[PDB]
Amino acid sequence: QLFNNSRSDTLFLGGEKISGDDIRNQNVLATMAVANVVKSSLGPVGLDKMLVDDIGDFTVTNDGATILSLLDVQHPAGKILVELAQQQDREIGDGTTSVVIIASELLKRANELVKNKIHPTTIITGFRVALREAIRFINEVLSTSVDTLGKETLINIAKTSMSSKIIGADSDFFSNMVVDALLAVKTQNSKGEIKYPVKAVNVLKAHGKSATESLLVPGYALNCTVASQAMPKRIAGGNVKIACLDLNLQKARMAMGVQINIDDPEQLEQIRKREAGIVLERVKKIIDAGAQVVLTTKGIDDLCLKEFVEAKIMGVRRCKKEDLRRIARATGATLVSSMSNLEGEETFESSYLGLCDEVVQAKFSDDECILIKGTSKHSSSSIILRGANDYSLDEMERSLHDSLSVVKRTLESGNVVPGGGCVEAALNIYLDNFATTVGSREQLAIAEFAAALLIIPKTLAVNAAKDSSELVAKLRSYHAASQMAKPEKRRSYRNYGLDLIRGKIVDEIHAGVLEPTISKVKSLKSALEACVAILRIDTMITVDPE
Amino acid sequence: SLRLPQNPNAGLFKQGYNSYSNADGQIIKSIAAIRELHQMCLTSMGPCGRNKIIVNHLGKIIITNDAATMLRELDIVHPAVKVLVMATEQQKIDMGDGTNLVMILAGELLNVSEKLISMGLSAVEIIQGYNMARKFTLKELDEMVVGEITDKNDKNELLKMIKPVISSKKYGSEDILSELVSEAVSHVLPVAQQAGEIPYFNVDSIRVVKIMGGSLSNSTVIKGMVFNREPEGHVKSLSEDKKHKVAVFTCPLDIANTETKGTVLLHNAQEMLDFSKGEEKQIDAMMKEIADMGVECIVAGAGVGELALHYLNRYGILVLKVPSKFELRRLCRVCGATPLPRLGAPTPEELGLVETVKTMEIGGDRVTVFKQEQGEISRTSTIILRGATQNNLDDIERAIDDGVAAVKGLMKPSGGKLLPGAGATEIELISRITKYGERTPGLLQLAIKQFAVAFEVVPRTLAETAGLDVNEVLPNLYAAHNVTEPGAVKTDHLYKGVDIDGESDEGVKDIREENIYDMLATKKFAINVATEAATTVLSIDQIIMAKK
Amino acid sequence: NFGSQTPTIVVLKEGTDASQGKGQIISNINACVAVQEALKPTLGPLGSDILIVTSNQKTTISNDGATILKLLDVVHPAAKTLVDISRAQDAEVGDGTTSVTILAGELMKEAKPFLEEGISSHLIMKGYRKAVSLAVEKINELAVDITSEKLERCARTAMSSKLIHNNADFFVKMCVDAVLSLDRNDLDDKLIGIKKIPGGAMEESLFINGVAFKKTFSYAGFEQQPKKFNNPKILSLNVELELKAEKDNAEVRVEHVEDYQAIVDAEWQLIFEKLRQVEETGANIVLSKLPIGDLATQFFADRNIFCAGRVSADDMNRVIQAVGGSIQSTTSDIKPEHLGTCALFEEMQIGSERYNLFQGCPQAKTCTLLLRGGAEQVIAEVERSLHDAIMIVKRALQNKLIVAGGGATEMEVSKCLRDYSKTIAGKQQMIINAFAKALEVIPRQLCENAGFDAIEILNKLRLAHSKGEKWYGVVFETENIGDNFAKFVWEPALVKINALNSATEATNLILSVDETITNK
Amino acid sequence: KTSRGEIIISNDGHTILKQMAILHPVARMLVEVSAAQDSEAGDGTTSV
Amino acid sequence: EMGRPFIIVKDQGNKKRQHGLEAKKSHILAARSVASIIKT
Ligand SMILES: Nc1ncnc2c1ncn2[C@@H]1O[C@H](COP(=O)(O)OP(=O)(O)O)[C@@H](O)[C@H]1O
Ligand SMILES: Nc1ncnc2c1ncn2[C@@H]1O[C@H](COP(=O)(O)OP(=O)(O)O)[C@@H](O)[C@H]1O
Ligand SMILES: Nc1ncnc2c1ncn2[C@@H]1O[C@H](COP(=O)(O)OP(=O)(O)O)[C@@H](O)[C@H]1O
Ligand SMILES: [Mg+2]
Ligand SMILES: [Mg+2]
Ligand SMILES: [Mg+2]
């Protein structure tokens, strides 16, 4: 910090050498330097940011998942928090902003314990006994998912994931959208285990009216253009057959080995005809099957387009692999990589075709999308987001994509807990009484671990531009009485948090904000494992590139 | 198509010259240029205001909360911002009080004018609007005045004067800082009650000497003055009573030298023998002459010779150096002596009266003190200001200059004419000026209306700097004035104001018992010069610069 | 309109810093914490020293806040507040500079988390300014009104954390006698002026009842004079004793050649007349600020009269108060009564440098010891250590106040602040308790440098204040904690009051700042 | 941190010595002793 | 750092520091370099 140290005094290293508490301080400032951009983005009162690529292109982002991934940091201690933000996005899909703030403060608050001659091995042991004591307390304080006669849960779960976004005001409209979407795309596996594939719904970057008037599609929407303009755009009537092909349909040569060498020039035209005829024989049998709509991964040559225009078939080129599996899964068809069977003959059976009620091509602001609705075998869903431009919709795309992961977890695990820093404030009262029981040096480690957990409710008040100590002191007073509740419900002074729009402490159950408990579990372990990785480093050895 | 003609007939003037007309939103930019440094001033207005590190070219640093002081060092490019610098500089020179009011008011008049020019009001009508508002504003300041001092010297009355002034600059503790000024003001004033003489007071009388070390509680009020000098011959505690005499000479205490080629000339050995002792004798004679008058300390104006020093410390005459004009003039006002450049006998009527001259260790260096006693009082007293950081000595010293400048406000007008502080004087004008807009017809009513909206910045600033939410504190205070004067006499809703610390809701428990007020003479010229700052910026529609 | 560019008018100069934020102030705190880290391990007797070499290649070794900070040209504006309080503490008291700086730092760290929460600034300053008023009053109760038992113990603690602490058995015996020569209400610091002698060992020093000044010039008749006078008599001069122009001019007209011989003999006549008046009064020692020529020193060399010159005015003022004479800038007004006397005179070889020793006076106002050492930093460290200790025993004579050292003052003040905070609100509470545990940084780092664990120490201090009413502190010898009154470790209270007032003024100065402007 | 940018944590003394690009030739002999300590037993690189 | 130039002492980049055990080894080996000159 003060000055640079001596460069390899009687050590003979080609790179730099540093040791002592200086690098330990640099890791604290390194974790705090990357955490300051994540501070202002926490909670509903947080504001978004924009990252410029020095080419005019920019992107608005609130969550710290892709922000830190875009920020190219060269200090390796900061890379662990960069990967921690990417790690938490894969498993849980929510809380990337919280693990960076929690992990940075655990290292910041533990920095005072380093110069007290407390070893890091004793500090992490005091943190770990506080962790498993906190997980059991989280397993005690969790609540059931019924709570009333009706459901009255999944609409409130979406508000927590939808908060701190541009469309947080429209969360009342989008709350019904996300719950209706994920309940349509469920599946069955492992003999009774229900799964919810995230990203299976199609998020379209449309422009137009507003985010409030975003129409939920009762079915999947394919984002691709029509091949020819003389084709029929709208296909009505029930039982519309869907054909999902992947083989190469354009005219292609024979295989590498085959070299056509001709001596009698009479058959030179005939081999040209059958190469043009062998590709049309495949199109002939599809017309015999009567597939109104056909989708192909590869291209479609003009030799095939004339047959679809004549027979009124909807041929669409330039499909992708991951989409057609969901079309076949939704419409009831099966993926056809090639047309063949166990016998030597070559034919096409009608069982390979799907079924749907209606298929309509729609265009909105230079975005052609094929709306497939009314799948008979299994339902599907897609969300047409509408906003200002593509870069504003990227925040909405990440906002919706994080919302599916949160609603995924509350259905896979019915246990939930309230937001507003409730469990973060409850663990402090639980760990203070436990810190005195253990006696020896781990009291300060467990105590400072509890003090670091309070940063989540404190940051909600700092970013709100209000008085923070009054809200924290009132939240401390109610949680202080929860441990001394004196059971005989009348077990009140629990499940309360901050209300930032009004600045009062009210019940989070009635306010309608919840979060699954599994997100709290994985975030605490991943935050502490990152804290263990930084505390145990003593000396750096940076080797210059050759 | 590939390149424009790049403004033809541009060679009329130089390439460095640029024009800036009212169009293209440039008047909005000039308001935005004011908004850059105006937001710096908001965080510096009031008792909770924050000082500013304004390092400069040299490296010489000053930490401060005054608008006029901070703007001296900053080199400004925008000319419209320099109008505020010289407007606050005029405020500091004349009255020495209310510079932040000039900066924050004139900046907000340009802020609300951003809405007026955008609506479509002509610039000529805008100046007529504020001028008609100014005549009504200065009229009502004389009407809603309450209280008066009526006594030049009093222990309790000065606490009402100095304390609200220094509360902005380095608040700290109230009593220890206010007593140093109220004690020093009573020493220098010519009281002379029941004589009919005209009062007189000088800003240069009270001066603060900065000494490092100690603490703010150890500061004392010295009757006389002090320098960081060393006696040459000997030091003396001077435990002898029966007061000494003082003789001031502006010329150096030494043998006469003419001016045109002073060179020795010795034709023979008889002159060589007598030229060396002639001097001793002559100097000795002049010095003995000086002493038969009973003088024991002489303040010299320039360098003193060694031969003259040998005869001065023979009889125990102290020597003091004052190598400057103003340092020598300030000392004569204490003892009341009349200097004469001649080396002869001081006149007995012109000899000064000083009882004791002590030399003690305060800041580790040698200092000479001239404390008088209750008998034979003197003027131009000093204040020993002790502190740890030299930067804090600079800002506290200028706070005494602001307090001494506030004492000047009592001499020229007929009396004190105090006003209620803590935003009460600003919030009262909002209702009076708003009613004045309803009485006058014409398109100037919007200019009168926005002039009242500009006065909300004083309560809004004090509520923001106090760590309170302005959305709840401001309209709670309007309820005291929305219940306007009923049929009962002696209404006490005028003393309601903001509060920095304490009760909720905030309507302060009067500014009364609190003993905080404002001066009428400060508010008169502040609103006058602030309106002139907005007048000159809004009246100009084209700006021309050079080299940048 | 006059140009196609139309440049946008910037408010400030290019390269003039712009500074708005909740941070900005955090950088000033981290800047102070950075400077505070360098002075951190230098606390207490078991600390360390700091080696600095500036651009001019001047080596220095010091543990004082002041010297170290100075040998450092600090350009950061907020960090120079620590430089000012160190010079302010060094100028008046001369001890515990470091302490003040470590206190400031901790107050600032506590202030930092509080600022990471909206708690604003005037609220933090009101807590320290209201708490420091009780700390000053509490220290007055911790201090004693001691008058019995008639200096020795206070000097041993002021010499800590530097060289001569281990040699306190020899230096404190003669250092106490330095201030006893000075009478009340004068306390002249220039009389304790001590010089440098490169060469020798510190153990061979001795106490001197007078002055010892370098001649700085080799005269032609220096060896002829005797070095030993049984009953010497000192007379201070100021006239220049050599053949030159009389009074700032030189112009002599001579017409006749017979008078040209007489005017030269007159100059030779008056110069011996000037010297004969010095000879007739019996002045054995002659001293003058101005130079002395070869003509005068050889005239004095014949009849056993020592002379010297090339001395400063500060040295001359120390000679008068030692011998008790006066200054006479004229040879005709010399009388016998104004001549100073002493016991004996002897010029001794000291580090290849000659010094004129005076000693054995019945009443001497001067104490001046010769500092001999190996390196130039050894003699410098012995000077600064004595200069810091001499100020403590100097001001101990001004007032008799004694408080317990070893970090005992901070713990007793912190306990009452915790009781005072336990009675008040919310905002202020947290602030006063934050000031309480932040005030305990002095015994915190004092034991970390000793190698002991801080948890076992700090847990023992708090729970044992009931029987350890006021004199409860750390003991390094027995590796235990006990009463400091039995160990005879004492320290005045003036270091504690000025430390808290300077530290409270330092932290409150920049806590009322949220801006940073840097032109050019 | 290696020359190719590959960051790696390592508490074992053998793997620490491989990544350290030591210029002194005699100091590089400790790299191979840890390899012999690692190859024979597989424990106590640091101790050796 | 937080992006701004974090400088304290004049000529920040020129001068260096040394602490811990490595500061001691520079001192003792510097004495051994001089002692080898004087030992022979
Ligand atoms: N309406 C609300 N009221 C109070 N707290 C909320 C609210 N919405 C979110 N939070 C808090 O914000 C925290 C993180 O929110 P999150 O939705 O993960 O933000 P992001 O989407 O930016 O990651 C949660 O721990 C929760 O307690
Ligand atoms: N303790 C206080 N309580 C309420 N109001 C105050 C207090 N101290 C100052 N004020 C108000 O804040 C205003 C600040 O005036 P200011 O322009 O800073 O004076 P100066 O010209 O000395 O800088 C004053 O007019 C006064 O009414
Ligand atoms: N003999 C001693 N026993 C215990 N503590 C001591 C002793 N001498 C000094 N101290 C402690 O060392 C601290 C610093 O004093 P000192 O070393 O004189 O100045 P500095 O603050 O510059 O290091 C004091 O707070 C004092 O309590
Ligand atoms: Mg979220
Ligand atoms: Mg004022
Ligand atoms: Mg000391």
Q: Report which ligand 3 atom has the smallest distance to the Cα of C408.
A: 27
Distance CA C103, CA C499 (A): 8
Distance CA B249, CA B547 (A): 54
Strands (E), C233-279: 233-237
Q: What token pair was written down for A67?
A: 């922000």
Does residue C509 contact residue C174 with C-beta atoms inside 8 Å? no
Q: What token pair was written down for B46?
A: 């009031």
How many CB atoms within 10 Å of residue A6?
16
Mutation pick from E2, E8, E24 vs chain C, by most beta carbons of C within 10 Å, is E8
Question: Strand C233-237 and strand C340-341: pairing?
Answer: antiparallel
What is the resolution of the experimental data for this entry, in Å? 3.4
Distance CA C121, CA C114 (A): 9
**What one-letter code names the amino acid at B421?**
G
Task: Please enumerate in sequence order all residues whose Cβ is within 8 A of that of E7, keeping only pairs 6 or more positions apart, or say none.
Answer: C75, C76
Q: What token pair was written down for B461?
A: 């600033």
**Nearest Cα to B475, choosing from B492, B491, B493, B463?**
B463
Q: Which residue of C has its CA nearest to A36?
A: C23
Tell whether ligand 1 has an atom less than 6 A from the beta carbon of residue A420: yes
**Nearest Cα to A372, choosing from A352, A356, A353?**
A356
Does residue B485 contact residue B491 with C-beta atoms inside 8 Å? yes
Q: What is the DSSP letter of C15?
A: T
Distance CA A94, CA A400 (A): 11
- Which three-class secondary structure string do you get for C440-479? CHHHHHHHHCCCCCHHHHHHHHHCCCCCCCCCEEEECCCC
Three-state SS at A458: helix
Does residue C142 contact residue C325 with C-beta atoms inside 8 Å? no
Cα separation values, B118 from B22, B23, B114, B123, Å: 12, 11, 6, 11
Distance CA C499, CA C505 (A): 10
Q: Which residues of C touch B81 (CB under 8 A)?
A: 11
Residue A63 annotated as catalytic: yes
Distance CA A235, CA A233 (A): 7
Helix (H) or strand (E) holding C350, with range, is: strand C344-350
Distance CA B480, CA B513 (A): 18
E to D contact (≥3 Cβ pairs closer than 8 Å): no
Distance CA C366, CA C210 (A): 6
Residue in A97, A296, A410, A459 annotated catalytic: A97
Task: Please enumerate in sequence order all residues whose Cβ is within 8 A of that of B331, keeping only pairs 6 or more positions apart, or say none.
Answer: B225, B248, B299, B322, B370
Q: DSSP secondary structure string, C73-109?
A: -B--TTTHHHHHHHHHHHHHT-S-HHHHHHHHHHHHH
Q: How many helices (H) and strands (E) does chain A have?
A: 17, 20
Rg over CA atoms, chain B: 31
Distance CA C329, CA C319 (A): 15
Distance CA A274, CA A239 (A): 35
Experimental method used, please? cryo-EM
Q: Which ligand has the shortest distance to the CA of B97?
A: 2
**Nearest Cα to A380, choosing from A410, A402, A359, A411?**
A359
Chains with 3+ CB–CB pairs under 8 A to E are A, C
Task: Please enumerate in sequence order all residues whose Cβ is within 8 A of that of B366, keeping only pairs 6 or more positions apart, or say none.
Answer: B228, B229, B230, B359
Distance CA C340, CA C358 (A): 11
Distance CA A269, CA A462 (A): 81
Q: Is A10 within 8 Å of chain E by CB?
A: yes
The length of chain D, given as a count of residues: 48
How many CB atoms within 10 Å of residue B512?
13
Cα separation values, C223 from B75, C302, C345, D33, Å: 67, 11, 15, 74
**What one-letter code names the amino acid at A514?**
L
Task: Please enumerate in sequence order all residues whose Cβ is within 8 A of that of A158, keeping only pairs 6 or more positions apart, or say none.
Answer: A171, A174, A175, A178, A179, A403, A406, A407
Cα separation values, D30 from B40, D26, D33, Å: 62, 8, 5
Q: What token pair was written down for A362?
A: 């729609």
Closest approach of D14 to chain A, Cα-based (Å): 15
Does residue B105 contact residue B130 with C-beta atoms inside 8 Å? no
Cβ within 8 Å, pair B361-C259: no
Q: Is C116 within 8 Å of chain A by CB?
A: yes
Task: Please enumerate in sequence order all residues whose Cβ is within 8 A of that of B496, keeping only pairs 6 or more positions apart, or say none.
Answer: B424, B477, B480, B481, B507, B508, B510
Does residue B58 contact residue C518 with C-beta atoms inside 8 Å? no
Q: Which ligand has the shortest distance to the CA of C482?
A: 3
Rg over CA atoms, chain C: 31
Does residue C225 contact residue C300 with C-beta atoms inside 8 Å? yes
**Nearest Cα to B188, choosing from B224, B154, B213?**
B224
C91: Cα within 13 Å, side-chain hemisphere: 21
A295: β partners: A244, A316
Three-state SS at B187: helix
Residue A97 annotated as catalytic: yes
Closest approach of C223 to chain B, Cα-based (Å): 32
Helix (H) or strand (E) holding A390, with range, is: helix A390-412
Does residue C300 contact residue C308 with C-beta atoms inside 8 Å? no
Q: Would you report the helix, strand and coil content of chain C in percent, each value rounded to 5? A: 45, 10, 45
The CATH homologous superfamily of the domain defined by A217-412: GroEL (3.50.7.10)
Give the ranges where A183-225 is alpha helix by DSSP (H).
none
Q: What token pair was written down for B65?
A: 């909360």
Question: Strand B226-227 and strand C371-373: pairing?
Answer: unpaired
Residue in A66, A96, A375, A459 annotated catalytic: A96
Distance CA A282, CA A346 (A): 10
**Nearest Cα to C87, choosing from C506, C452, C410, C383?**
C506
Chains with 3+ CB–CB pairs under 8 A to D are A
A to D contact (≥3 Cβ pairs closer than 8 Å): yes
- Cα A539 off chain centre by: 36
Does residue B423 contact residue B465 with C-beta atoms inside 8 Å? no
